[PDB]
Design an enzyme around this catalytic site. Structure first.
Site, short mmCIF file in Angstrom:
data_model
loop_
_atom_site.label_atom_id
_atom_site.label_comp_id
_atom_site.label_asym_id
_atom_site.label_seq_id
_atom_site.Cartn_x
_atom_site.Cartn_y
_atom_site.Cartn_z
N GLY A 184 48.22 30.32 63.53
CA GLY A 184 49.62 30.69 63.41
C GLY A 184 50.62 30.19 62.34
O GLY A 184 50.06 30.55 60.77
N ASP B 230 44.56 29.59 80.72
CA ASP B 230 43.77 29.95 79.51
C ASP B 230 42.58 28.84 79.38
O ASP B 230 42.60 28.86 78.39
CB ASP B 230 44.27 30.08 78.31
CG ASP B 230 43.78 31.55 77.41
OD1 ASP B 230 43.17 32.61 77.72
OD2 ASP B 230 43.83 30.82 77.03
#
Ligand code: FZO
Ligand code: MG
Ligand code: MG
Length: 261
Positions: A21, A133
């Site tokens: 990102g 996660d």
């Protein structure tokens, strides 16, 4: 000779480990030709959701590393309205990249990596975090140990290349459309991969029924017999689809697989 200054000190960029990102991680040297990792976040544009996730990561990283040396160390950081720089212990490599090259794991080293990951995950559960996660990329190898990097918050980055999964997600996460039990599932998938050289549903290469397989009771995972039957037992207890019957982290820490030898 690209460089970074951080709260006084200068660092030479050896290379860019990864990006994600608006982030970048560099492998760098300090003035004493010592090696470090520096994470950079370009905050120039980034909503208050992104901003806060990064502020939370830095706080927990700063808190947690007093309680465990299986958390990657944050040595210093600089934060303004434009950017972040974090100086951290640099890993030799991440566990995903390392697995994907090794033929077969030394059994005593698998056992040791396993204790490392339990301790780290245990530490973040104690201070009120569920990663949710977990996957191999979240662990780095440094000093023969496994140390955790990501906490779930902040956006995951990816190793960069000079050219140009979902296998770990717990079933109750799929039915969420989540507790400390969800991280033991994801840890079992890693250990399973470290044992049988493959993820439980690593072969269902089409995703929607990879997902389906994961949530499906009468779909059964295969636990070939192996010499270390305590390790067969760890995997069978981690990979129970029903969260409430799945083994917990405090129990895994009392298990023969980690406590004997
Ligand atoms: C030599 O150094 C490394 C090299 C590599 N690889 C990957 C394959 C090719 C290669 O050479 C991976 C990790 C490290 N060492 C490292 N990597 C970090 N971030 C990586 C960001 C991209 O995904 C994996 C993790 C951090 C970190 C943060 N945030 C704080 N310390 C860190 N140390
Ligand atoms: Mg080359
Ligand atoms: Mg390539």
């Amino acid at each position: 000779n690209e460089c970074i200054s951080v709260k006084g000190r200068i660092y030479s960029i050896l290379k860019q480990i990864g990006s994600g990102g608006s982030s970048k991680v560099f492998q760098v040297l300090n003035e004493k030709k010592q090696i470090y990792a520096i994470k950079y976040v370009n905050l120039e544009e980034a909503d208050n959701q992104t901003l806060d996730s990064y502020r939370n990561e830095i706080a927990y990283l700063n808190k947690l590393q007093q309680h465990s040396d299986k958390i990657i160390r944050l040595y210093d950081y600089e934060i303004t309205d434009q950017y972040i720089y974090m100086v951290m212990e640099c890993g030799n490599i991440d566990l995903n990249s390392w697995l994907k090259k090794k033929k077969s794991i030394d059994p005593w080293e698998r056992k040791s990596y396993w204790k490392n990951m339990l301790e780290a995950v245990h530490t973040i559960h104690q201070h009120g975090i569920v990663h949710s996660d977990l996957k191999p990329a979240n662990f780095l190898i440094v000093d023969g140990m496994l140390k955790l990097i990501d906490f779930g918050i902040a956006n995951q980055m990816q190793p960069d290349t000079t050219s140009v999964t979902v296998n770990y997600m717990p079933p109750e996460a799929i039915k969420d459309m989540i507790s400390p039990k969800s991280d033991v599932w994801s840890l079992g998938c890693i250990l399973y991969y470290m044992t049988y050289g493959k993820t439980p549903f690593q072969q269902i290469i089409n995703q929607i029924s990879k997902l389906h397989a994961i949530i499906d009771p009468n779909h059964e995972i295969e636990f070939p017999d192996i010499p270390e039957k305590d390790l067969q037992d760890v995997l069978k207890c981690c990979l129970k689809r029903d969260p409430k019957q799945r083994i917990s982290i405090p129990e895994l820490l009392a298990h023969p697989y980690v406590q004997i030898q």
